[PDB]
Design a protein around this nucleic acid. Structure first.
Ligand code: ADP
Ligand code: BEF
Ligand code: MG
Ligand code: MG
Ligand code: MG
Ligand code: MG
Ligand code: MG
Ligand code: MG
Length: 438
RNA sequence: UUUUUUU
């Protein structure tokens, strides 16, 4: 029932180009700019329009309450993706930002969202959000909403999370009383738009987080329905650690004259702070191998572990076998009630439960303090998924370890895996090589 | 049963 709106732009009006270089940035010579990017491994796709990178938080002219939250976090320097992404976002250009897992992409798009909103007329009664952020999972949308909440406690900005499995009442109430920032999964937002609980008439700033996942074949049509409701002169910002060829052309259906920035290797790459370990075994030894791994992991104080499996059924079965065998393990997947999913992820965040067993519902975006191990019990569907899964550890500056159970049935992915491992200068299991050569 | 994504 949702039809592509054709906006008549001749009526409304809104503010776009408000970024002004800080004096420490204005005085940067081209040499100094190239050295900044080179040192931070920032690449601006050749021929694109792009401001200079900043190298300090005060360069972005965030409001003071934002800075106070940054100082409460004791964040001392913006990450590479923030150094180049803050100014580009704040300048108003459509963009694609590609940077390794745990590199701070969330703030890279949330804080310019706040400045953006601050240069707009205030919301009136009945107005929809100015900034819309779209994410592939309910937990990820809730996490991003809590970030936006920490940086808006001392301002007039309100945000809300719009996602399924949760009661509609409080979400509808948030929407009708008015929020500047809306974080959403696609289904529940489509539902609310069709029934008129919210609308996208004031939406001028649109973020696709985990953008390559949102453009895959199951999400693309939902993304298209939502984005057909947004004025075509909106600013569009796509973010991910992975940007495979197959999505690139498609992304341009939702972008105008955009700029792409990459941090790190232009090819597919994991975060280099993860120790990557690959075990070649048969399917049938996976159970035994896991137990031995866990017995090692659980002999140390810092033991927080995510275990990834391919299906909801194996998620349940492995979890039950671990807990009957007796381990302190809990699971999260798409057939759990949303109350159970929230309870399990909160227990895992807070250190009450050291072992999470998950499907790919937990593979993207989740930022959980002190995850020290990631275990691919089942190899994932793609190299990209591999990179995101193991990026659940070694966030920000921390280190972490990834163990992968690789079987002859995974053989057609071995090559691509080897390429990720070599790109991260890892010691390659000779058994993996020898499996490929035969 | 890939996995997610409004009852
Ligand atoms: N400038 C910074 N300095 C230190 N830590 C930061 C900075 N920006 C963000 N972080 C922290 O890094 C962690 C991962 O950031 P996040 O946006 O989730 O990464 P990504 O989206 O790039 O995977 C978060 O806990 C976040 O608070
Ligand atoms: F890329 Be981060 F892990 F969302
Ligand atoms: Mg400081
Ligand atoms: Mg954050
Ligand atoms: Mg401002
Ligand atoms: Mg086998
Ligand atoms: Mg993220
Ligand atoms: Mg759905």
């Amino acid at each position: 029932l949702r039809k592509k709106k054709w906006d008549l732009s001749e009526l409304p009006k809104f503010e776009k180009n408000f970024y002004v270089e800080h004096p420490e940035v204005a005085r940067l010579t081209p040499y100094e700019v190239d050295e900044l990017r080179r040192k931070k491994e920032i690449t601006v796709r050749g021929g694109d329009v792009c401001p200079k990178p900043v190298f300090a938080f005060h360069h972005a002219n965030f409001p003071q309450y934002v800075m106070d939250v940054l100082m409460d976090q004791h964040f001392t320097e913006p990450t590479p993706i923030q150094c180049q992404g803050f100014p580009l976002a704040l300048s108003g250009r459509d963009m694609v930002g590609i940077a390794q897992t745990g590199s701070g992409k969330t703030l890279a798009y949330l804080l310019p969202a706040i400045v953006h909103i601050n240069h707009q007329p205030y919301l009136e009664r009945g107005d929809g959000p100015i900034c819309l952020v779209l994410a592939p999972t309910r937990e990820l949308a809730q996490q991003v909403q809590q970030v936006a909440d920490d940086y808006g406690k001392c301002s007039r900005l309100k945000s809300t999370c719009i996602y399924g499995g949760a009661p509609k009442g409080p979400q509808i109430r948030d929407l009708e009383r008015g929020v500047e920032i809306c974080i959403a999964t696609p289904g529940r937002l489509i539902d609310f738009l069709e029934s008129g609980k919210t609308n996208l008439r004031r939406c001028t700033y649109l973020v696709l987080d985990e953008a390559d996942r949102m453009l895959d074949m199951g999400f693309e049509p939902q993304i298209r329905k939502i984005v057909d409701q947004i004025r075509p002169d909106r600013q569009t910002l796509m973010w991910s650690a992975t940007w495979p060829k197959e999505v690139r052309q498609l992304a341009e259906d939702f972008l105008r004259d955009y700029t792409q920035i990459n941090v790190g290797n232009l090819e597919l790459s994991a975060n280099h702070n993860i120790l990557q370990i690959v075990d070649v075994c048969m399917e049938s030894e996976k159970d035994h191998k896991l137990i031995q791994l866990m017995e090692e992991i659980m002999a140390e104080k810092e033991n927080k572990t995510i275990i990834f499996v391919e299906t909801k059924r194996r998620c349940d079965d492995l979890t039950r076998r671990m807990r009957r065998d007796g381990w302190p393990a809990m699971c999260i997947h798409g057939d759990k009630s949303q109350p159970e999913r929230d309870w399990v992820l909160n227990e895992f965040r807070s250190g009450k439960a050291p072992i999470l067993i998950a499907t790919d519902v937990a593979s993207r975006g989740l930022d959980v303090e002190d995850v020290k191990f990631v275990i691919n019990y089942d190899y994932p569907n793609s190299s990209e998924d591999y990179v995101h899964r193991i990026g659940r550890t070694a966030r920000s500056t921390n280190k972490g370890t990834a163990y992968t159970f690789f079987t002859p049935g995974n053989l057609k992915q071995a090559r691509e895996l080897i390429k990720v491992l070599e790109e991260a200068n890892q010691a390659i299991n000779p058994k993996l090589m020898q499996l490929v050569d035969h």
